[PDB]
Write a protein that binds this ligand. Structure first.
Ligand SMILES: CC(C)=CCC/C(C)=C/COP(=O)(O)OP(=O)(O)O
Ligand SMILES: O=C(O)CCn1c(=O)oc2ccccc21
Ligand SMILES: O=C(O)CCn1c(=O)oc2ccccc21
Ligand SMILES: [Mg+2]
Ligand SMILES: [Mg+2]
Ligand SMILES: [Mg+2]
Ligand SMILES: [Mg+2]
Ligand SMILES: [Mg+2]
Ligand SMILES: [Mg+2]
Ligand SMILES: [Mg+2]
Lengths: 274, 273
């Protein structure tokens, strides 16, 4: 599988596009823009960009069409991690072994940098030079991202995670579907929209794909860490379920052409990682 | 008093629209949505909605056309105040004698509720049923609000404030223009775009208006506090004179506008009394 090569290509592409967004328009704003840059340019794997590019290719679009989509979903993702790391939330000093933004700078600056990243995400999609889709398509991208990022999506999931106490599998899945599923789903949907060849049946299929891989990731993460999927189902039964989720993802792409292979490969990668 | 009646009408209208946005879609989200509601439905005067409605009317649009614009700018405003109140920012326990959101609920909840409000402001403008403008207009409204709300606007102003040091007037005005001026200017621009009649000249004139009133609000707030601030820099009498000069610049920007701009004229006068 060339998923590692595909991941590296999407990472490089989106990293170049993102890095160009962090130039302060005036000197008084330099430190804020530095905190924004620090919060995004942290060597992340850019899975949500990968998804946008791969969904766009799956429907036959040239990947560059999805550049704004890739940037927007990464910006949302980045802003959410900054807030998640804050003392009032997870109170993390480190993220992937490097100081969190509130430690590198200060708490007010982290809060603010991340708020500015959220606005930027929406700016990038509404900018018809950076996101040169048909207007109705740009508006649909923005609608979907705002719904996915907001209180009925990602932020909702963070609230559900914080508010939770024994969860059963159904409740764990509701939490995951909001906290990470919504934005994963939006990454796929936005890339699909960026293709210019979206239609309802393909969008629905791609939504099924995205649902399945979003959960697969969480199941396999729990397995690798060994109220978790192994605790709930048993270890070996959790491993089984990860395969079933991969299979649902692959089945959702039945009938898609070979250009959907990156999506297929990602589905396998998620459950094969050791 | 004409302005008082106009403000009351805008307040009631936008409050009805806003209140309807805070219904949790499922039970696990109820407390979050309560915190969102608590943060917005707080008896605010709704100056930014007023500006959107009045700019729309100034260009001959029916005010209802600006309903989404009015919501969006108020949602931005509301979110900004929730984050500003947090312990790491202004650490404010009360706003008009009522607990701030982090006090009423908890800090994480407040952070999250406000993050959701920001997303919602964009959702409301991108929704073509709620914001039924021509699609190019919807996108321009969203572009302008995201620029005004973000790190080059409102958030930038908050960063300049934390980064500030005896400021001189010029530096104080750079701070104010970002921290509050961007969003005031966006409110006027979005209401003007909602009219369906915007043109480059009228937009530019309305921007000059908005610049002037945005600063006049700050100068007059400082004066009222007395009755690094405008009175401290200039002395009380000269700060008062400056507020009057800004009102004059605002009225001058409205040269040529029809009587439907009277609300804007009246607001400019109200601010400096
Ligand atoms: C609305 C906000 C701030 C959302 C955060 C969403 C999210 C994915 C947080 C990380 O989860 P985690 O805390 O379980 O994972 P990590 O180990 O990455 O902190
Ligand atoms: O370690 C690496 O740099 C690549 C590991 N990796 C990979 O090979 O494919 C991926 C897809 C998403 C995220 C990570 C992936
Ligand atoms: O007494 C009140 O509650 C409203 C006073 N008020 C008014 O009369 O016009 C206004 C415009 C903007 C904000 C407040 C205004
Ligand atoms: Mg967390
Ligand atoms: Mg965490
Ligand atoms: Mg887990
Ligand atoms: Mg403050
Ligand atoms: Mg305060
Ligand atoms: Mg107070
Ligand atoms: Mg002041």
């Amino acid at each position: 599988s060339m998923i590692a090569a595909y991941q590296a290509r999407c990472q490089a592409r989106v990293d170049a596009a993102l890095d160009a967004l962090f130039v302060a328009p005036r000197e008084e704003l330099q430190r804020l823009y530095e905190a924004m840059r620090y919060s995004v340019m942290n060597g992340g794997k850019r899975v949500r960009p990968l998804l946008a590019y791969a969904a766009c290719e799956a429907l036959g679009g040239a990947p560059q069409r999805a550049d704004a989509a890739a940037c927007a979903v990464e910006l949302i993702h980045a802003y959410s991690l900054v807030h998640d790391d804050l003392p009032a939330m997870d109170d993390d000093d480190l993220r992937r072994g490097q100081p969190t933004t509130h430690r590198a700078f200060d708490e007010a600056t982290a809060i603010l940098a991340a708020d500015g990243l959220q606005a930027l995400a929406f700016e990038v999609l509404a900018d018809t030079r950076r996101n040169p889709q048909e207007h109705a398509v740009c508006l649909e991208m923005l609608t979907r991202l705002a719904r996915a990022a907001g209180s009925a999506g990602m932020v909702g999931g963070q609230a559900i995670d914080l508010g939770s106490v024994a969860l059963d599998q159904a409740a764990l899945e509701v939490m995951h579907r909001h906290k990470t599923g919504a934005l994963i789903e939006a990454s796929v949907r936005l890339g699909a929209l960026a293709s210019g060849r979206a239609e309802p049946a393909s969008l629905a299929a791609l939504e099924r794909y995205a649902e399945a891989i979003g959960l697969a990731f969480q199941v396999q993460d729990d397995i690798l860490d060994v109220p978790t999927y192994p605790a709930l189902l048993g270890l070996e039964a959790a491993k089984g379920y990860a395969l079933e989720l991969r299979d649902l993802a692959l089945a959702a792409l039945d009938g898609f052409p070979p250009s959907a292979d990156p999506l297929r490969q990602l589905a396998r990668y998620i459950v094969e990682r050791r």
